[PDB]
Ligand binder design. Structure first.
Ligand SMILES: CCCCCCCCCCCCCCCCCC(=O)OC[C@H](COP(=O)(O)OCCN)OC(=O)CCCCCCCCCCCCCCCCC
Ligand SMILES: Nc1nc2c(ncn2[C@H]2C[C@H](O)[C@@H](COP(=O)(O)OP(=O)(O)OP(=O)(O)O)O2)c(=O)[nH]1
Lengths: 368, 58
């Protein structure tokens, strides 16, 4: 909110950030370390969304730099198909059965009708969900606000747009809603959301500017498909989130300047809504007592594994998402014997890790 | 003797020699149990079972 010019200098944290990447924050940690002491005017969450290929990433980086905000790059399937040691899981796909073959954005743009599309869309929701929670931990433990490109709240638009084009089936949409309902309610909605309304014709021109191989060659980015996204952002997402978060709309800040945009944000006031307790605007982040602050911090810092275990919703009547038992055995063999997947990250000796005899530590909010 | 005196029956005499495994089975059984329990923990966390031998020794 207070840019570097307003403060005249870099952000001055109220107190030292808690090392949330390395130390857990359970109940007994909360007794000695309090949460509210670190919150500033800039302790907020910003979602910089827009249509496809609207230069959100460039705008976010510049924006997050002015407001001294942490910038979180948009999720991609490389986070699933590239392990920590850097090995590419996709190289293993010749071995795997066809149903378990790797699927990415490239594939979606090239064979959008494949049954793995329903899988692919749920993964994006799951990835955004985990990343979104990671931002909250950074906010609550460091007090520095975060800038996100696309929140999990906005992800159902792509699933809905894909459904209208007929790529998905009725079942896949039914499954997606149950996951979203089962999980979405546990997040804190963003303080501010910024939208970059590029008209439909413009984005179609803009996509060809990137000159990405598969996108230009693809057929998915049709007028109908791209039009569906526009109708979904404005009619369903933006109309809903504005009840909680401040909403700014620009034709394209990616093509425009950000210094004007930062000066637009700082004009927006975030305290007028604080007066009424039950006011919907920014309701989620209204904690009366210090206990409520710590509870939210504990939930995301210490109970994220619970948050990521709600995605277990059993639905087998849908045939697309089900993975056959015979494939699962084969897939388990190949997947978990790949270099670096034998053990948890940081223990695979064959990948060069050393000292395992005297090593006993595991990461926090780490897998396995 | 031809007599059945219950007090004689209970009273020890030192003739019996406890088996060899007797004074060591409970120590050795618990010792192996502790190590084996430590072996699960690594396995449960998908760690090399003999990694972090510190916990095994403890
Ligand atoms: C097959 C492995 C199955 C393991 C089942 C364990 C049950 C046997 C047991 O625990 O006791 C066996 C006994 C050890 O005890 P013991 O030598 O009789 O002397 C008194 C001990 N304080 O020792 C024995 O009776 C010897 C046979 C069993 C242990 C070898
Ligand atoms: N099926 C599906 N595709 C998505 C989703 N989110 C992003 N994409 C796909 C659509 C496009 O093929 C492609 C567009 O990428 P982006 O719009 O995110 O651009 P990028 O973040 O790389 O940089 P930029 O937006 O230009 O700042 O990714 C989703 O939720 N579902």
């Amino acid at each position: 909110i207070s840019g570097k010019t307003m403060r005249g200098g870099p952000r001055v944290p109220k107190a030292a950030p808690y090392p949330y990447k390395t130390k857990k924050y359970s109940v007994f940690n909360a007794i000695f370390d309090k949460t509210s002491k670190r919150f500033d005017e800039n302790s907020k969450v910003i979602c910089v969304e827009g249509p496809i290929a609207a230069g959100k990433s460039k705008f976010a980086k510049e924006l997050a730099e002015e407001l001294d905000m942490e910038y979180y790059p948009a999720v991609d399937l490389d986070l699933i198909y590239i392990n920590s040691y850097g090995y590419d899981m996709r190289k293993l796909d010749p071995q795997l059965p066809p149903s378990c073959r790797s699927y990415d954005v490239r594939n979606f743009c090239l064979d959008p009708s494949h049954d793995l599309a329903a899988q692919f869309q749920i993964r994006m929701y799951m990835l955004r969900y985990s990343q979104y929670i990671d931002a909250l931990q950074h906010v609550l433990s460091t007090g520095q606000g975060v800038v996100l490109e696309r929140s999990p709240y906005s992800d159902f638009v792509f699933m809905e747009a894909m459904f209208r084009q007929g790529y998905l089936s009725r079942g896949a949409r039914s499954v997606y809603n149950e996951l979203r309902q089962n999980t979405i309610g546990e997040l804190l909605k963003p303080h501010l959301v910024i939208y970059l309304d590029l008209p439909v014709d413009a984005v179609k021109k803009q996509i060809k500017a990137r000159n990405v191989d598969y996108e230009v060659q693809s057929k998915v980015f049709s007028d109908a498909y791209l039009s569906d996204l526009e109708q979904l952002y404005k009619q369903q997402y933006l109309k809903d989130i504005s009840t909680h978060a401040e909403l700014l709309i620009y034709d394209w800040t990616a093509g425009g300047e950000t210094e004007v945009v930062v000066e637009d944000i700082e004009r927006i006031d975030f305290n007028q809504f604080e007066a009424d307790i039950h006011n919907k605007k920014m309701l989620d982040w209204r904690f009366p007592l210090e206990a409520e602050w710590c509870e939210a911090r504990i939930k995301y810092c210490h109970e994220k594994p619970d948050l990521m275990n709600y995605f277990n919703v059993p639905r087998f009547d849908v045939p697309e998402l089900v993975r056959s038992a015979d494939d699962g055995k084969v897939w388990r063999d190949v997947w978990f014997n790949a270099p670096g997947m034998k053990y948890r990250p940081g223990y695979n000796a064959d990948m060069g890790d050393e000292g395992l005899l005297t090593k006993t530590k595991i990461g926090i909010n780490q897998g396995i | 003797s031809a007599v059945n005196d219950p007090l004689e029956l209970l009273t020890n005499k030192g003739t019996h020699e406890p088996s060899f495994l007797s004074p060591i089975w409970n120590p050795i059984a618990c010792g192996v149990a502790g190590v084996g329990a430590a072996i699960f923990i690594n396995w449960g966390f998908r760690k090399p079972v003999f990694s972090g031998i510190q916990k095994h020794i403890a």
